[PDB]
Design a binder for this molecule. Sequence first.
Ligand SMILES: NC(=O)c1ccc[n+]([C@@H]2O[C@H](COP(=O)([O-])OP(=O)(O)OC[C@H]3O[C@@H](n4cnc5c(N)ncnc54)[C@H](O)[C@@H]3O)[C@@H](O)[C@H]2O)c1
Ligand SMILES: NC(=O)c1ccc[n+]([C@@H]2O[C@H](COP(=O)([O-])OP(=O)(O)OC[C@H]3O[C@@H](n4cnc5c(N)ncnc54)[C@H](O)[C@@H]3O)[C@@H](O)[C@H]2O)c1
Lengths: 468, 469
Amino acid sequence: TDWPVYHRIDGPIVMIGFGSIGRGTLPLIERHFAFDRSKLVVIDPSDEARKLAEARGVRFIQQAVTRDNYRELLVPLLTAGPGQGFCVNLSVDTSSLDIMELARENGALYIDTVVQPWLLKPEARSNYALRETVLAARRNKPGGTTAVSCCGANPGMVSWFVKQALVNLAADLGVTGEEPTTREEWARLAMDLGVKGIHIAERDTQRASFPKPFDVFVNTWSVEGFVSEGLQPAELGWGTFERWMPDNARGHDSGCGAGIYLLQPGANTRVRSWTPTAMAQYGFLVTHNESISIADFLTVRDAAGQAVYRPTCHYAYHPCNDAVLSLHEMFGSGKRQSDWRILDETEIVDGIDELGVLLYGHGKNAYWYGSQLSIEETRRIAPDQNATGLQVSSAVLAGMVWALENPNAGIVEADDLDFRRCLEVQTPYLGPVVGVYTDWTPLAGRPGLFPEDIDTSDPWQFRNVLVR
Amino acid sequence: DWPVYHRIDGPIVMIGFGSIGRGTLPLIERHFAFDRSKLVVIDPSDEARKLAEARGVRFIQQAVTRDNYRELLVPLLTAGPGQGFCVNLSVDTSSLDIMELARENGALYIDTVVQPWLGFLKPEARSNYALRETVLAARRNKPGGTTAVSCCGANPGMVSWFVKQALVNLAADLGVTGEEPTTREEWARLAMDLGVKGIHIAERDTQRASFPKPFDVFVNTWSVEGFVSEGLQPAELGWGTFERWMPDNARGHDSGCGAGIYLLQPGANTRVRSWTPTAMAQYGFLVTHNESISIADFLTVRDAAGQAVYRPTCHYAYHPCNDAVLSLHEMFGSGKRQSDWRILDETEIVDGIDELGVLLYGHGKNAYWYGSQLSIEETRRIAPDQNATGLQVSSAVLAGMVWALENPNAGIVEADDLDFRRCLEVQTPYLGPVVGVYTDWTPLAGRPGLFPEDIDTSDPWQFRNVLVR
Ligand SMILES: NC(=O)c1ccc[n+]([C@@H]2O[C@H](COP(=O)([O-])OP(=O)(O)OC[C@H]3O[C@@H](n4cnc5c(N)ncnc54)[C@H](O)[C@@H]3O)[C@@H](O)[C@H]2O)c1
Ligand SMILES: NC(=O)c1ccc[n+]([C@@H]2O[C@H](COP(=O)([O-])OP(=O)(O)OC[C@H]3O[C@@H](n4cnc5c(N)ncnc54)[C@H](O)[C@@H]3O)[C@@H](O)[C@H]2O)c1
């Protein structure tokens, strides 16, 4: 009845970054893998991180990993032996692709939760473009040591939820038969079910024991990371059903073809969305890797290679109340707050991180599938983190298990992993995982007091979702 | 001790006993001498009844409606022996109809808002410009007569007196010579000569509650029903002659004073870039307010032909308390009102201020904020039964009442028509720090930035730059 130990790691474990996610992932690595304790080392420039690592009894190197030092630092650490090591990258300000390629070159497994560069026109700031660098790297060097790109809660877990949700939608219609095996089969299942689009539909209700301080940005995970992505252009996977886009929307000349972006910051762009606890709510259209990767994954092309079916996919994020206030403060002031803080589990009085996928446009209108993990449950089952952190760290755990079980798979996205195996590892840490149908649409209660440019023939059009 | 300004020798009829009525009644008892059993409070709610009974004040548990207001109020207003005073602090009642009833029965009248009877509409008809035009027409139809003070709370109300004092201060600091204005035409000419392109009613409420905001509860420091109703009205502003651009969904008015436009979107979901001393640069919401129109109208200069050659832009730039910001996000994101609401009591507020002032911009010193920084701690020391928001309003009602008793045959008047020095002399003891602050901030601070924006770089204070689009 104790915790399962999934695998032995026969080489160094190098954790890059020991912020909110690193702190939550370390205890799960220790819990679920067998290895000599001295094999693990944490790298992070922060004094705060150093003091926590010392209290946890783990090796700690207080250094920022940079383009200038990453080869001389990471190659010896990852190749120390006797066997294959694992690079666990949970940092800000480091090049995911460069570290990934270095790990592969040296036979070390690799996982991260984001594609980002080393510490510029808007299209270059896009997660579409960054994802294209990873796809190109895979084409240049197929196969080889497994490296898992963007395997956190979102991007990451939500790709597995999309697959489970598609299977459930079919079953709820009385459609029986083997589930898809190939990418094209998954894409055709979405097409055949009439899925028009998908929101990554999230509502964080975690509340702090102190009121939000003036001129302090407050969040339940990285403030630096959230602000960085929130200032990037709004970004979405763009569905074939869409008949309207804003005047300030732009596409891409190259790549998989699945994305557009808007010439405005994602964290100041609102969309109409829905989760089970929030019901109808505003989300922020913050750019995310999975907005592109899920739309790409579910694309059906004709013989000529043109996409004839693709779902819309984007984030619709309602963060914790203090983060909502922090965004209002930041954008209203035109500048970042002087200080910031990430809520510790000891500072959260109650709440959940409700994180799921909202598939819409099919015969049952809309279906939300995801996790309702509470802070109370989090504290009972995993230390050193809040409910936001545990969804992410447990997804990293699942990706690490998959990579150790499938060590010769090359560069892979969350959409490439065995979703059933990953969810089997992750689900002890997700609290209630539920599927909920709703009849809500973005046109509920509309038109109202004022004229609006809506498309009443198709309630889920982005024209109706975007707050204008 | 506290000054007793005057005796009131007739009935005092208070319509509405919510957050503002509860804050105003103690000031009335404190600052006027009157037969105490001559005060009557009318409110439909049981909560109001219990509070009035606890004070031993006559109470009538009725909702004033178009169907009953004549039969209900006339006996109360004319009960004698002397001139009565109708103090209207309610939601859901016709300001104009009750004002006219008071006037034709010789009773003084004051309120803090122009609003219609609760309905059992074209966007233009929902505008405060239209509502104010019904009051202006009433004045033209019955000049002079018994005084009725329209829209004399904190804003609208006190901020009109702040605008006059700020113009005086700017004149001194910019070396503009001339005697203090004493007529509307002289005030308007002073604003023109100072180069005041526009005015924000620039407010930041930092009052914080001892409990976190509950899900599906709208929280505010004053009327939730009243704030939501005004926040769903069209965004609305006095429209200055310097403006070179208006949004595609802006509209004007065929008739009336000519000072206003409105936008075909709700004010409480419309953001503007603004500034207060404690907030520094912030978003405010462009909630419609009577003074947006009245201040712009008051400061209009016309040529001989009657065409406006100068007028300041004027509008609200409201940053309410944090729990109200979250309540608006919740309400607009859900597309419907929350199932419950609450107004923060002073006992529930841990700290904070209601920073309420006027931001005059476009002149030689860029921008100037003048107003009140009243804290909840100071409020509790000097006045009972209210928070810092309520006390700024209730003290303004007091000031207007003192002015009306000293000027009881002035006809229908707005806060812009009162003697601002006398009103501020009555109100200032309840306003805490009242300060003027210059800033170099403009709406183009930091702009253009990461993304292309439709800005006017020739003039930072253009509405094109202020409006969040
Ligand atoms: N996919 C997901 O679900 C998901 C969820 C949360 C976060 N993330 C990603 O992970 C990132 C980290 O999140 P977090 O909440 O732990 O952030 P955090 O801000 O709490 O921690 C970041 C850590 O990185 C360290 N760091 C900074 N520069 C470094 C360098 N050059 N080398 C090594 N370490 C460095 C900092 O000292 C800090 O301790 C986020 O910015 C985000 O991109 C992904
Ligand atoms: N000018 C200003 O600065 C300013 C400031 C605050 C409020 N106001 C105005 O004053 C109004 C009242 O403010 P509040 O905070 O006291 O509101 P509130 O919601 O606390 O109280 C309103 C009261 O009116 C009563 N009421 C409802 N229908 C009625 C009717 N038909 N007849 C008589 N009473 C009735 C309610 O029972 C309630 O007690 C607001 O809606 C707003 O328009 C103006």
